[model samples]
Target: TGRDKNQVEGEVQVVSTATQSFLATCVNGVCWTVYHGAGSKTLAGPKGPITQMYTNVDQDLVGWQAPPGARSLTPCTCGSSDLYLVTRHADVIPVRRRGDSRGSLLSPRPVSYLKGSSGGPLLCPSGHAVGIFRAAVCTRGVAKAVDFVPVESMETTMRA
Candidate 1:
């Protein structure tokens, strides 16, 4: 269960608001996640202090600064077809690259994703994270594709 290639290098933490909690990960100790609401009251990271730093409605992004000891992930392209959806419960679901950072589940055998999974990471075969979970499009009980914000889209804020 530990050190699985499907698991991302960065720590996937839970960011909880009043109603729900989603996922987030650190990059250079700076965590990024989807903005579910304004008041992010709780954060659970890997043996580090996590504090809210930023949020932008336009990109649906939020940021948190963690202690430097936090294991971080790097952003990469979503161009690769070998991908996995790392859900909040750590379920690694194989996915196919659709378009626009969207991915579709290979089969209908998987479940456990909910609104709380909105900020989960889409990791590549090598375990590099590429996208942030947004929402899923479904048809006839099949998950067609999931909308995501490419971590590539998040780099602009990481730089000065």
Candidate 2:
């Protein structure tokens, strides 16, 4: 809860060519994002191709190191409390821990308007990041839930 919205909500942008928006955040001079799966590939960025610096395909996570002189964001603390999801529409929706499984832990069920908002960051109320938005779970063809990776998981791979 010691997070600052301004500090955590930096200019992290989408870094993938996927149909859905795939976001990347710069940390410790590198840019990190999620990889959809095997079909995903390197993407062009401001300098050149944004190549994978590390990947955990099973976790659907991929990170890239930005080119020299690229601006980076201040790394924020990661947690599961008082969370919110930033949508492509610029909407910040509060999230609640809805279930025991990590998959359903942070649910934004009532507001299912997010489309093309994958890879967006989930932030703690204090503005520290929780993780990247992965997908919205649907039931009966209607999106009833959402999913995101915990930033802690990303740190494990990136730090090593």
Candidate 3:
């Protein structure tokens, strides 16, 4: 793949409110993150206001609107088993697909930072975002699997 992780990370914003902060995947300035921690009316993103919180308990994600010129990371255009867990700290953990909507990190260690990364992007080899980080499953002392909500799910729910 010709994709650069550094450039890919640029599109992912570190969005935050007063209480919590995490990564948000932005596409055409439209960003998505977990609703509960995304603040009530506005969020602080790198370029503009992450406004208009969209929510659905079943779907479990939210999107905010802004900008016609912001750089975006498009959703996956095709399927790929080779994936990555992109973190706000510029860590790109290699992931192997496990099931329909989840994957396992190739090198499972107790990455302390990963424990707190709730809204990181699950990126495909094509540099497109495929899913949102939902959970990291650990067994004994090592991470075994990670769950993700598909990008399509959030796109549908965020629509009014």
Candidate 4:
């Protein structure tokens, strides 16, 4: 009888927000990074322009802030290690174009950031790419609220 062992490393995808973060998916048995700084890179991909959905976070940049009046987490989705698309008063946010960037702290750009080690998922994917993993939002270090990408969507344009 005989046995074999091997090791390998590939790319890791991940997403992020201002106050929170999570893993996007797993490739080669690893997760992406979270958070904006650390090692995340916005304008990293070649998507031309990253349009983040925004309400009041400014058109130049997108941010997830506590909405007015309603005070609660948006009605989106999440996992144990990260948040998918939760749209509560406070959750994830996207920014788009059409804004002033000359008189603000920083000129908001369409491209967002993808931090390292444990960031969000891969914004881009191919037919041979293995989707990353994400989780729900709740008490830290809790896997009870975790979730993964849908198989069908994973094969769509977003994932592929």
Clashes of each: 0, 1, 0, 39
Give, for candidate 1, the lowest lDDT window spanning 10 residues.
Answer: 107-116
Off by over 4 Å in 2: 1-8, 15-20, 37-40, 67-80, 99-112
lDDT computed for candidate 3 = 0.71
Backbone clashes (count) for model 3: 0
Give the candidate order by descending lDDT: 3, 1, 2, 4
TM-score (C-alpha, index-matched) for candidate 3: 0.77
Rank the models by TM-score, top first.
3, 1, 2, 4
Worst 10 residues of 3 by lDDT: 3-12
In model 4, where do residues sit more than 4 Å from their true spots? Answer: 1-7, 13-42, 45-130, 139-141, 158-160
> Per-residue alpha-carbon lDDT of model 2 for 1-160, expressed as tens digits?
6856646346566544645455566655666666763235666767765557787767777767556776543334544555677676667766675642234434434334566666677666665566677657776545556667765566688778
| lDDT per model vs. reference | 0.67, 0.61, 0.71, 0.27
Choose 2 or 3, whichever is better by lDDT. 3
Q: Write the per-residue lDDT of candidate 1 for residues 1-160, one digit (tens) a residue.
A: 5565644344776756546666666666777777655345545456555566776667777876656875677765535686777776777777877776666768653234444577677778775777778766776545656778877677776663
Highest lDDT scorer: 3
Pick the winner on lDDT between candidates 1 and 4: 1
Model 1 pairs whose backbones collide: none
lDDT value for model 1: 0.67
lDDT of 4 by residue, 43-68 (tens): 33233434322211111112222224
